[PDB]
Design a protein around this ligand. Structure first.
Ligand code: SAM
Ligand code: SAM
Ligand code: MTA
Ligand code: MTA
Lengths: 387, 387
């Protein structure tokens, strides 16, 4: 209709007028409008059928469909794609019709297919690995959660070894120990670590202000990236602040450090094997950095991780927790759905600012500053000192 | 910000101004805009987390939360709901924060909780049963589909006994036969049958034109509702055309007829046990009516269902197929996701108009008229005659 076409034009123009945070606000508003305007039948159909997207994306990934379509220079028929990818022709046609209906691909007026933005996204290895993680790891845990809670009379989940994960995968191990026995899941996780989120904390972190008159002499450490994965934070730090002296150290387990060597700069960033359940070896660093680490642990274990760092700190040292800080009320779906998932798989939780401060106070830490860098979903670098 | 509030105001006014079909078009446009404006990370987070809605709706149903909240006269704290419903207080608080973020409930400015439109929807028994069906029946089949297809080198699914269902539930039975052996699932399906879709075919079906000079004597049947469930079509027919002569007959299996007695009118509608895989007993009826029946069967079995009716027809008899008629191109998510689901569970498929005509021609039937009654997703009463 002319009205819906005009709605689309105006929302597209408003989205172009603003920045990425304004666009995120607009998208959340579109979701709220959808939910408020759907009929009861629509609500049930949406909940029933939006499930299809993850399974169908998993199939397209298995087939290599999104990568292939992303590199195509002209629209492709369903028969061409089926023959190229080794898929039944009718199966491929039905899959593509569904995918086009949810913009996973685009369907042309002559019933051929081209890449959409979502096609290109699912072709990126790290983002593809995120979707595959949702299918193979998250889905079974969420499928097990309702009956787990029912059988246990709805307990408050507090223990990584006693949550829905153990029911879903028929094991008594916690998720992290179980994963070490699953090579294909490990391989997918290694690809998942190559995804770099944007924006990052350096977009708003006032580094020179927080540094003050800290001296890197004689040979002190500026930045210790604890569980840093591929070291993206270290790389971006050296990129934005190339002249700031001090050691920059990536700490992780040996297999992921080995994976990180391929893309690490030739010099300037150390790779130090370190298990963050053991005392922090680097003494007196300016910043001990924990990005998306503590969210994966219940309070008692997250506390242990902080307690292992505290003895290494001097008066100028800071622990920087870079993580989600959802609000007391009005939290968005992308910071509450995470909470349900990490509850069900890891026994952990999202933490408000007050909850972060309580946890850190148990380690003897005090919040000095908080630097938000995403909106409306809150990710922030929280700077803690001793006392 | 102010912009988001203005978008909501204007879209709400436009939605109020139009009818249900215009609102459905607007909602589809809002979904398309959301998908087109999300970031790559947003896409993966959405696919990862929208899954949570079905699991959390199942938990809320298990707790009786939506029915309870729907009958509350004031906002309720999370502690009050937890204590009343027998749920851990922190678990209840986290569940409610997530539900509020996806409008499954509403959160007030003082962090209490009231019903939303979706709360009320999930409190309705038939719609609740739809959500429970999505969780317990659809989700396992979709979880099994990618590896089923991979192990079988991506076959065209054509057989109700050889699809993802058999892997999901570790059985050689087809879905309907297996479900008949599962009493709790049967009970849920009986509640699901009490949901009546709106609008229905009588909103556009020119009954008097199709009847012509047809005579109901001697004791002939006007309308035979084959697999009619609770008999809603019979009830609405008698309601809209109370003076039209001719028997009106609800045909289904005995347990469903028994369930239907509670809500059936005291006179005017016959309850006749009949299995639609067997020859049709009522001879020379004007309309043999099949609503949302044939979509659940692959072509050879749907053909058998029609062939069991054809010998009962005289020259004035018509078979009326009331079902989805998705377009050749540009089909919507609510008529393609259905296709993927019924492929994976039942071996069946959605059918375009041309595919319906091919199938019916195998039974000796010819399309006379097609009366659409929903938009933009196509449901239509297709009228077939002999020859
Ligand atoms: C969320 S991932 C990567 C987060 C990373 N800081 C980032 O934002 O780029 C968590 C990281 O913690 C690492 N890790 C898990 N257990 C660890 C342990 N016991 N000691 C050190 N690192 C660990 C993983 O190998 C992984 O690289
Ligand atoms: C989609 S449901 C209800 C459809 C119904 N026409 C309506 O629109 O409400 C399918 C119906 O077919 C019935 N059914 C399933 N197998 C049947 C059979 N073999 N013979 C007769 N009815 C059957 C079920 O009991 C159910 O009522
Ligand atoms: C976008 S990739 C991260 C997504 O997967 C979920 N997730 C990530 N890592 C884990 C993990 N180790 N265990 C359980 N869920 C996870 C998070 O809720 C998020 O939605
Ligand atoms: C509102 S319920 C409609 C849903 O029922 C689903 N469905 C799949 N198999 C069956 C079945 N055997 N019985 C009833 N509904 C089913 C379809 O996928 C559709 O999304």
């Amino acid at each position: 209709m002319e009205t819906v076409a005009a709605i689309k034009t105006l929302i597209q123009q408003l989205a172009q007028s603003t920045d990425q945070f304004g666009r995120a606000e607009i998208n959340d508003a579109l979701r709220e409008l959808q939910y408020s305007l759907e009929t009861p039948f629509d609500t049930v159909m949406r909940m029933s059928l939006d499930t299809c997207q993850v399974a169908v994306a998993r199939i397209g990934s298995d087939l290599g469909l999104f990568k292939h379509l992303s590199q195509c220079a002209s629209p492709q028929s369903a028969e061409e794609l089926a023959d190229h990818l080794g898929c039944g022709r009718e199966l491929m046609s039905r899959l593509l019709r569904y995918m086009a209906s949810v913009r996973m691909v685009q369907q042309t007026d002559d019933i051929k297919y081209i890449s959409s933005n979502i096609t290109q996204t699912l072709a990126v290895p790290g983002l593809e690995a995120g979707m595959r993680h949702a299918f193979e790891n998250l889905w079974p845990v969420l499928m097990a959660l309702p009956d787990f809670l029912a059988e246990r009379k709805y307990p408050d989940i507090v223990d990584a070894k006693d949550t829905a994960f153990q029911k879903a995968f028929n094991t008594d191990q916690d998720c992290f120990h179980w994963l070490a026995t699953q090579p294909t899941r490990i391989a997918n996780f290694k690809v998942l670590l190559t995804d770099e989120r944007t924006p990052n904390f350096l977009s708003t972190f006032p580094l020179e202000k927080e540094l003050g008159s800290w001296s890197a002499e004689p040979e002190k450490a500026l930045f210790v990236d604890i569980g840093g994965g591929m070291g993206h934070a270290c790389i971006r730090l050296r990129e934005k602040y190339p002249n700031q002296p001090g050691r920059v150290i990536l700490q992780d387990l040996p297999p992921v450090l080995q994976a990180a060597q391929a893309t690490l700069p030739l010099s300037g960033i150390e790779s130090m094997p370190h298990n963050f359940h053991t005392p922090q070896p680097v003494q007196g660093a300016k910043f001990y950095f924990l990005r998306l680490i503590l969210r994966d642990f219940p309070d008692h274990q997250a506390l242990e991780i902080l307690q292992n760092i505290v003895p290494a700190m001097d008066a100028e040292s800071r622990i920087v927790i870079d993580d989600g800080v959802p609000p007391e009320k009005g939290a968005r779906w992308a910071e509450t759905g995470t909470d349900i998932c990490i509850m069900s798989a890891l026994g952990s939780k999202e933490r408000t600012q007050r909850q972060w401060e309580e946890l850190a106070a148990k380690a003897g830490l005090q919040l000095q500053a908080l630097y938000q860098y995403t909106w409306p979903v809150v990710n922030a670098a929280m700077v803690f000192s001793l006392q």
